[PDB]
Write a protein that binds this DNA or RNA. Structure first.
Ligand code: MG
Ligand code: MG
Ligand code: MG
Ligand code: MG
Ligand code: MG
Ligand code: MG
Ligand code: MG
Ligand code: MG
Ligand code: MG
Ligand code: MG
Ligand code: MG
Ligand code: MG
Ligand code: MG
Ligand code: MG
Ligand code: MG
Ligand code: MG
Ligand code: MG
Ligand code: MG
Ligand code: MG
Ligand code: MG
Ligand code: MG
Ligand code: MG
Ligand code: MG
Ligand code: MG
Ligand code: MG
Ligand code: MG
Ligand code: MG
Ligand code: MG
Ligand code: MG
Ligand code: MG
Ligand code: MG
Ligand code: MG
Ligand code: MG
Ligand code: MG
Ligand code: MG
Ligand code: MG
Ligand code: MG
Ligand code: MG
Ligand code: MG
Ligand code: MG
Ligand code: MG
Ligand code: MG
Ligand code: MG
Ligand code: MG
Ligand code: MG
Ligand code: MG
Ligand code: MG
Ligand code: MG
Ligand code: MG
Ligand code: MG
Ligand code: MG
Ligand code: MG
Ligand code: MG
Ligand code: MG
Ligand code: MG
Ligand code: MG
Ligand code: MG
Ligand code: MG
Ligand code: MG
Ligand code: MG
Ligand code: MG
Ligand code: MG
Ligand code: MG
Ligand code: MG
Ligand code: MG
Ligand code: MG
Ligand code: MG
Ligand code: MG
Ligand code: MG
Ligand code: MG
Ligand code: MG
Ligand code: MG
Ligand code: MG
Ligand code: MG
Ligand code: MG
Ligand code: MG
Ligand code: MG
Ligand code: MG
Ligand code: MG
Ligand code: MG
Ligand code: MG
Ligand code: MG
Ligand code: MG
Ligand code: MG
Ligand code: MG
Ligand code: MG
Ligand code: MG
Ligand code: MG
Ligand code: MG
Ligand code: MG
Ligand code: MG
Ligand code: MG
Ligand code: MG
Ligand code: MG
Ligand code: MG
Ligand code: MG
Ligand code: MG
Ligand code: MG
Ligand code: MG
Ligand code: MG
Ligand code: MG
Ligand code: MG
Ligand code: MG
Ligand code: MG
Ligand code: MG
Ligand code: MG
Ligand code: MG
Ligand code: MG
Ligand code: MG
Ligand code: MG
Ligand code: MG
Ligand code: MG
Ligand code: MG
Ligand code: MG
Ligand code: MG
Ligand code: MG
Ligand code: MG
Ligand code: MG
Ligand code: MG
Ligand code: MG
Ligand code: MG
Ligand code: MG
Ligand code: MG
Ligand code: MG
Ligand code: MG
Ligand code: MG
Ligand code: MG
Ligand code: MG
Ligand code: MG
Ligand code: MG
Ligand code: MG
Ligand code: MG
Ligand code: MG
Ligand code: MG
Ligand code: MG
Ligand code: MG
Ligand code: MG
Ligand code: MG
Ligand code: MG
Ligand code: MG
Ligand code: MG
Ligand code: MG
Ligand code: MG
Ligand code: MG
Ligand code: MG
Ligand code: MG
Ligand code: MG
Ligand code: MG
Ligand code: MG
Ligand code: MG
Ligand code: MG
Ligand code: MG
Ligand code: MG
Ligand code: MG
Ligand code: MG
Ligand code: MG
Ligand code: MG
Ligand code: MG
Ligand code: MG
Ligand code: MG
Ligand code: MG
Ligand code: MG
Ligand code: MG
Ligand code: MG
Ligand code: MG
Ligand code: MG
Ligand code: MG
Ligand code: MG
Ligand code: MG
Ligand code: MG
Ligand code: MG
Ligand code: MG
Ligand code: MG
Ligand code: MG
Ligand code: MG
Ligand code: MG
Ligand code: MG
Ligand code: MG
Ligand code: MG
Ligand code: MG
Ligand code: MG
Ligand code: MG
Ligand code: MG
Ligand code: MG
Ligand code: MG
Ligand code: MG
Ligand code: ZN
Length: 63
RNA sequence: UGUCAACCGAGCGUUGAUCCGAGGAUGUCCGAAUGGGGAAACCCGGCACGAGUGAUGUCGUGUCACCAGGCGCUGAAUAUAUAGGCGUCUGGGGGGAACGCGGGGAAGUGAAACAUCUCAGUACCCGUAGGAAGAGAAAACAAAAUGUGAUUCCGUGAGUAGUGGCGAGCGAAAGCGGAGGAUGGCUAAACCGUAUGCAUGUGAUACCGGGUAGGGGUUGUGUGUGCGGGGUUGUGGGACCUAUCUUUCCGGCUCUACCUGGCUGGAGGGCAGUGAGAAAAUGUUGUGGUUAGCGGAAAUGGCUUGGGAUGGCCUGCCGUAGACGGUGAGAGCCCGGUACGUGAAAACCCGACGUCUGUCUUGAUGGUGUUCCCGAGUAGCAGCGGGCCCGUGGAAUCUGCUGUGAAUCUGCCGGGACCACCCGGUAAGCCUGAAUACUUCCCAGUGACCGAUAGCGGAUUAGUACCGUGAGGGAAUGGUGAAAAGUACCCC
RNA sequence: UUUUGAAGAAUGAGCCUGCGAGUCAGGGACAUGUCGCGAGGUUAACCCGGGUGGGGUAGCCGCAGCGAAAGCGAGUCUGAAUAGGGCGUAUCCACACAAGAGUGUGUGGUGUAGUGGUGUGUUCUGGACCCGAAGCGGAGUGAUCUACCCAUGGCCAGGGUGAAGCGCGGGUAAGACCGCGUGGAGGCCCGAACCCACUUAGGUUGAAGACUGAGGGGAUGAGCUGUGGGUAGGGGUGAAAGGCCA
RNA sequence: CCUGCAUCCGGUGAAGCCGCCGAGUGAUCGAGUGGUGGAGGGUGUGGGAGUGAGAAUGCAGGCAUGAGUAGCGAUUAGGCAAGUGAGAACCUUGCCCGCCGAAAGACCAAGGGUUCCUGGGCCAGGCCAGUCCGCCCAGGGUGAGUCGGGACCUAAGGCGAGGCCGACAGGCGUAGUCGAUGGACAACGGGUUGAUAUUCCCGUACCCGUGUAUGUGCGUCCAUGAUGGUAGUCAAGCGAUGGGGU
RNA sequence: AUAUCCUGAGAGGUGAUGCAUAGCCGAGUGAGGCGAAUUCGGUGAUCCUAUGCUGCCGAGAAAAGCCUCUAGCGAGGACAUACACGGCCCGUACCCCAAACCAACACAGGUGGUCAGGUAGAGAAUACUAAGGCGUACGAGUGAACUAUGGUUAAGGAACUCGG
RNA sequence: AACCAGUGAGAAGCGACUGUUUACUAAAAACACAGGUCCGUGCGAAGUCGCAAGACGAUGUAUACGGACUGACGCCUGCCCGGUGCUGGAAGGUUAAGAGGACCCGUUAACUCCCUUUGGGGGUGAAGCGGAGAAUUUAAGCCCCAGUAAACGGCGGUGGUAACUAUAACCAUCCUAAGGUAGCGAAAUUCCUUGUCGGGUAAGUUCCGACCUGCACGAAUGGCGUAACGACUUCUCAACUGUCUCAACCAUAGACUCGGCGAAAUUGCACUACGAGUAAAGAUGCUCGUUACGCGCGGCAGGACGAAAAGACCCCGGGACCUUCACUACAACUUGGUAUUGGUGCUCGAUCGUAUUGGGCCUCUAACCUCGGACCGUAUAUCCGGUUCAGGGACAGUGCCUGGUGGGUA
RNA sequence: UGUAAGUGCACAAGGGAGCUUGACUGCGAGACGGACAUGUCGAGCAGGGACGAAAGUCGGGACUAGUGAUCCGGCACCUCUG
């Protein structure tokens, strides 16, 4: 739950602000889920972490 | 025949010692440690080739990690195939004082308190290479001037325009003047060829510019990929037809033989070359400098005090050399050397002079109307955060994440919301030296800087003794005199 | 020294020789002397000179001010108002006009002085006269004593107390129960080593940075101890006292 | 005090120190004189100061009183004759007396590294003097097929090829290899020098390996046998990285 | 069935015509030579049989080695005797209930384990003692008070002290 | 016969016993201890450490495990559900993000009047581009209603009503939830207190047994007893003794002289009297007066505000830790939307059949999930990966925004 | 004699009656006391009003208490900017 193995999108770091205008540390992590990639026509897939961006763009096929 | 620091015994050298300059071998063990093991410098092996004993026991020289990337073989449950397994080559594991790039990232303290702020993007950490790095060829400014023309670094522009519990504080840009010259080059798209596959075929009147004609595969027609031409831009450009001008020879092809228009090979003549624009090697110069050395001028002058003249008085000489040190007391002419001249076996790097490599000349020049192209989850939009003076405020621009999601030249984006008219430009791919930053080391120089409680903690046994089981802390100790001639000898 | 008030019984001083304290940086600011120039002064960054010298007009202040502005100008803003007011035209004298509500309104003159270096007092930003804590964060180091647990050994001198069970003689129909011999279960009892620390006297510039002399509790267990291992600081551990962590 | 400039002094004695004599309204001065010394100084006028001490329970070094006062670190206690030598209650020899004796004795592991022996001396140390020493100097000294460890095996635990997770840094744990306080494993008595002893010697034992010779002696090539009975295997001898006992 | 096997204390023979010793001679920092008897009883273990046996519950390491089995290799190997050989690396002095270790010291503390004689004694307590080792590092004198550790004391016995 | 070698009894209080604790002032009435009750846990559990895998719980499965209060054994364990938590009913009101676009304006196409010639100067209006943007939708929390005291908690005063004196020993007044059941009581609780009564010696503010006037005893922060036990606290009795009237004597190690070595704290100065005075209010050091040869040794300690640690007690200023309905945040938990995210069916609505795009429910498998079984990588593997079989399944988990609880942390 | 006290008012500022909103706009010569900013009075000018024939008075209440800076923001208008 860190980075997409394909596009390598790492998490970004920022500062969270309360309604009292006081600052504090917080982190944002890109949406990535475990899916079996469709790359070989042979009909075999392997467990690889992927990101919604790559999945929806189809860089790893759906089948 | 190094040195602390005398002393003895031993020896070499004119047949060139010692010394210094360049290159070359050996180089026990640990230390990324990598034959295996482990509490640093200590224990135990395999394999091959040699040495030794009547044979084991023994001994010498090689070789015996891991990971990643190529290449070859092999193909499990399981069939296609993969994972996995073997053989062989190429690379990497650590260290380094400062200098860079991208991230993470704190608390003391001011506001006479303090949450926002500031301290500060500081200390520290992480991943990273170099001798420098990064950045870089406008989707840039400005405003009606017919302006500038890549980037970087300094001085102004000013403590102003702004911002802030409008407190404490924080802080630009444009333009202008300087250092440098390369206002440089590459790459995917529009279309033909070629190894292919996936396909399907009316498998025959379609593939080839016209005419004579032979046939049914340069597949008849589509798709994705590797390989060579033609193109690289803003007054838009590039691909197709249509006229004009056309600065070597020959061959094979445009299905085929014959004329017309195109594709490709073999030979002049230019073009550059270690180069960012393509890469590899091989044949002949600079008293270019550097790593040592060598030459190098003139008073034993006289008189005086003296232990000692390098002190005082009087006479000389050199000066392309009166910088600086030593010598028994302040030395141009005593010594070391200074001005100046020379000077290298080997090696270094620079520059210049020579085989070889490769694009183009099958090609270039100025026009025309039509059909296709100009960098995809991108630009923009909505939500949540950063840093620009802008501390969400009307919020421009850049950027991180999540959803939605566009077009190809009367297209698109920019001139601090936004609309209309004007003006500039062509992002979503990649390289690019010169102007700049720094010294752990070496060479040469300087001090209205310190002289032993000062000066680096360290002028001597120095990061030693010592303290602490640890990170770590951290001490004080120079002057005899010209030479030791360091007081023979006698006496208590 | 600090005190309104002290020779003090308010503090500092054993003696001696050394070491120890209003400086620096910036074209900063105000003020004050000093030198050139004079309606100008004035150079940065950067070039050429073993050298302090010579170039370098990019910049900054006075030269006109008023008004938030479109602007205007010896005037200007407020304003319906030459109608009074706010700011400015260096200052002055003289000449005329008004009231003499103190002064103002119009003409002519002498005519204005600022700017660069530098000495000195203060001030701005750097810790800015000298020295002086309890505490915070980041990064690292310790469970060899002390707490707990884990694997593996050793340790407890002597002497008493006698459950179940068992066999025999009684009781019963069988028992419970009644006596007789064996057994040593006991977080049982008295008492060594070891371990603990209750009272008491000494020590207190001690022999010892927490002991000694007399007495005091366990001693087969929640026992004692050796060997090697694990537990890291807003945390560990803790038969729980706000203890321990060299 | 250091410096630019111009001057003067100095082995016929420059700088500090200790006196005498004097001098200015002050911080002081003397080119006026005496002893010590041996190597650089003064005046005039400019520029720059780490430029002037008595106190902060200041710091480095040296030294005052209490002071020739307390103590000289237990629960046993010495005495005598002789010797050595300059020195003897503290050293050597001999004779009495006392103390300890679940230790105040004889040993192992951990712990230190030359404290062990021989020879030399007694300015450093021993709480006093020392001929003595756990002071130092110079030399010498440590002997394993069988004792403790390694080459044999394992635990609580540590490392960790692959791998999982994690923004990076990093946390986990498989196969394996490390880790005695355990298991198995083969020697005892006596003698010996100034220091070594299950180690050397004497006497007698035990456990693994290699070579040669000899004797039992069995097969490969013949072939009986048992068979499942022509033919195909075979039970010799080794025997596990595997199974099962211990 | 004391069948058969295993184990196995203790006893007995061998090791040993050897070694050592009480003692006798000369000989002294000491060495040399010679060298007797060595039978029977009592007491009695914390040591052996013993990983035994009997009770109890809180219910009690692994690997290696050894034996065996085949799988599998296999034509030389097994046994016995004799002769002649090899058997690897580190630890090895001295100090150990302390003047040599832990405590700043030549310290009134601590430090795991093994040896345990005689007499009285229940004893590994207590008293004197053998083997064995010590007189441990400032001394000599002196009826002061006072201090501290002991010893004794008429009659009352707790009347002091907050408190036997 | 030396040495060695337990005083005993009678009560009360507290605790059931043996045990453990503040190294270095406190060993207890403190702590735990076996008994019980309640709460929570359906199994890669809850609870943990760890942002994650994973590990413990357990190589176990409610006749167990985690949390809480109590403490052997005997007789027992009263009333109250308003407030706050917890478990249920959310059947209504309220509101976040997101969907949604009533109306409005800016903008110039087109224009509405003069004014020219080739849309502005004095208002209408299309599209596109933008802005605030309203009504409708929502889920949680909050308000509403029941249960729970071995959950945190509370359990009063007021008046009247006996045969002579004594008071309430029944009824009603306010309130809320009721206004102390058993048991005990001048106690480890009691200020007025040495309360009153009986025991104890001559004397008893201690002690023992009772009296109820319980400021301010009380039954799971338990009450009253209780065999045995306690280096726990208080009192009484016999024996004893130098603890006393009342002290005396003897020995050891110092204290003392002699010999040797040789110590520390402090220190402004010194040929450092006293009586009465004088002052920063207590004088060796000042005024008047009295006394007093110089220098030592052994003894005693009133003074020299003697030595020790920049006073702990007080205040000022600044820290640290702690508590909560003080403020502001965070972790964690929890609610919806949205992406991951698929197909077919029933059922509810805003331009009784006609149009509305979002809710509720049931199904199917391919996404996805399972510390389920069997095989292979594999000689040794409870790791890991792959194939297959078997179950869940468009949920859950996880990204982004958001509403709530939140002394667990800052 | 509205609201406490004092100072005043018998001429009125006590009461009664008719009309009317000067409880205006643009200004202000000078003084009052104050460390600072806050606080107090005022003659007189112009516009356009009120009362009164006129002379004349009116910039709230016989007098002294009935209140609050800075910053930020809202509303109307403006011959400012853009
Ligand atoms: Mg990731
Ligand atoms: Mg950041
Ligand atoms: Mg912050
Ligand atoms: Mg060399
Ligand atoms: Mg070599
Ligand atoms: Mg290695
Ligand atoms: Mg290694
Ligand atoms: Mg590779
Ligand atoms: Mg296949
Ligand atoms: Mg590196
Ligand atoms: Mg403050
Ligand atoms: Mg503050
Ligand atoms: Mg900043
Ligand atoms: Mg480089
Ligand atoms: Mg660039
Ligand atoms: Mg770029
Ligand atoms: Mg600027
Ligand atoms: Mg400031
Ligand atoms: Mg091309
Ligand atoms: Mg191209
Ligand atoms: Mg001379
Ligand atoms: Mg001369
Ligand atoms: Mg010179
Ligand atoms: Mg010389
Ligand atoms: Mg010189
Ligand atoms: Mg020379
Ligand atoms: Mg902002
Ligand atoms: Mg904004
Ligand atoms: Mg604009
Ligand atoms: Mg243009
Ligand atoms: Mg472009
Ligand atoms: Mg540069
Ligand atoms: Mg000196
Ligand atoms: Mg250390
Ligand atoms: Mg002062
Ligand atoms: Mg004073
Ligand atoms: Mg004063
Ligand atoms: Mg005074
Ligand atoms: Mg005094
Ligand atoms: Mg004082
Ligand atoms: Mg004082
Ligand atoms: Mg004071
Ligand atoms: Mg001093
Ligand atoms: Mg001192
Ligand atoms: Mg200033
Ligand atoms: Mg000035
Ligand atoms: Mg001047
Ligand atoms: Mg005026
Ligand atoms: Mg800290
Ligand atoms: Mg550790
Ligand atoms: Mg029984
Ligand atoms: Mg018994
Ligand atoms: Mg007893
Ligand atoms: Mg003592
Ligand atoms: Mg200490
Ligand atoms: Mg004691
Ligand atoms: Mg004791
Ligand atoms: Mg006693
Ligand atoms: Mg005892
Ligand atoms: Mg007792
Ligand atoms: Mg007991
Ligand atoms: Mg016990
Ligand atoms: Mg550690
Ligand atoms: Mg407590
Ligand atoms: Mg401690
Ligand atoms: Mg000088
Ligand atoms: Mg001279
Ligand atoms: Mg001289
Ligand atoms: Mg002289
Ligand atoms: Mg001299
Ligand atoms: Mg001068
Ligand atoms: Mg001067
Ligand atoms: Mg200066
Ligand atoms: Mg100074
Ligand atoms: Mg001084
Ligand atoms: Mg000192
Ligand atoms: Mg003293
Ligand atoms: Mg004394
Ligand atoms: Mg004494
Ligand atoms: Mg002693
Ligand atoms: Mg003697
Ligand atoms: Mg004894
Ligand atoms: Mg004994
Ligand atoms: Mg003993
Ligand atoms: Mg040891
Ligand atoms: Mg050792
Ligand atoms: Mg010795
Ligand atoms: Mg000697
Ligand atoms: Mg000596
Ligand atoms: Mg000494
Ligand atoms: Mg020696
Ligand atoms: Mg050996
Ligand atoms: Mg492991
Ligand atoms: Mg690895
Ligand atoms: Mg691991
Ligand atoms: Mg190991
Ligand atoms: Mg071991
Ligand atoms: Mg031995
Ligand atoms: Mg026995
Ligand atoms: Mg051998
Ligand atoms: Mg060895
Ligand atoms: Mg030895
Ligand atoms: Mg030793
Ligand atoms: Mg030793
Ligand atoms: Mg010992
Ligand atoms: Mg020591
Ligand atoms: Mg000692
Ligand atoms: Mg000791
Ligand atoms: Mg011990
Ligand atoms: Mg014993
Ligand atoms: Mg004795
Ligand atoms: Mg002895
Ligand atoms: Mg005494
Ligand atoms: Mg006594
Ligand atoms: Mg008597
Ligand atoms: Mg008596
Ligand atoms: Mg009394
Ligand atoms: Mg009493
Ligand atoms: Mg009670
Ligand atoms: Mg007890
Ligand atoms: Mg306890
Ligand atoms: Mg404790
Ligand atoms: Mg204590
Ligand atoms: Mg203690
Ligand atoms: Mg205590
Ligand atoms: Mg206790
Ligand atoms: Mg107790
Ligand atoms: Mg307890
Ligand atoms: Mg109960
Ligand atoms: Mg229980
Ligand atoms: Mg319960
Ligand atoms: Mg769980
Ligand atoms: Mg409970
Ligand atoms: Mg209780
Ligand atoms: Mg209790
Ligand atoms: Mg209720
Ligand atoms: Mg309720
Ligand atoms: Mg309530
Ligand atoms: Mg909407
Ligand atoms: Mg609720
Ligand atoms: Mg309610
Ligand atoms: Mg009572
Ligand atoms: Mg009671
Ligand atoms: Mg009471
Ligand atoms: Mg009382
Ligand atoms: Mg009483
Ligand atoms: Mg009493
Ligand atoms: Mg109470
Ligand atoms: Mg309760
Ligand atoms: Mg209850
Ligand atoms: Mg009781
Ligand atoms: Mg009595
Ligand atoms: Mg008596
Ligand atoms: Mg007496
Ligand atoms: Mg006597
Ligand atoms: Mg004595
Ligand atoms: Mg004494
Ligand atoms: Mg004495
Ligand atoms: Mg002495
Ligand atoms: Mg003092
Ligand atoms: Mg007085
Ligand atoms: Mg007095
Ligand atoms: Mg006083
Ligand atoms: Mg006096
Ligand atoms: Mg006095
Ligand atoms: Mg006097
Ligand atoms: Mg007088
Ligand atoms: Mg007299
Ligand atoms: Mg006193
Ligand atoms: Mg005092
Ligand atoms: Mg204090
Ligand atoms: Mg305070
Ligand atoms: Mg804290
Ligand atoms: Mg959503
Ligand atoms: Mg979703
Ligand atoms: Mg989507
Ligand atoms: Mg709160
Ligand atoms: Mg807190
Ligand atoms: Mg009236
Ligand atoms: Mg008004
Ligand atoms: Mg005025
Ligand atoms: Mg008027
Ligand atoms: Mg007026
Ligand atoms: Mg008025
Ligand atoms: Mg009126
Ligand atoms: Mg403010
Ligand atoms: Zn991706």
């Amino acid at each position: 739950a860190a980075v997409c193995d394909i596009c390598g999108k790492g998490p970004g770091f920022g500062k969270s602000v309360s309604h009292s205008h006081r600052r504090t540390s917080r982190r944002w992590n890109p949406n990535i889920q475990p899916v079996r990639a469709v790359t070989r026509p042979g009909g075999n897939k392997q467990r690889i972490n992927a990101c919604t961006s790559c999945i929806k763009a189809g860089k790893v096929s759906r089948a």
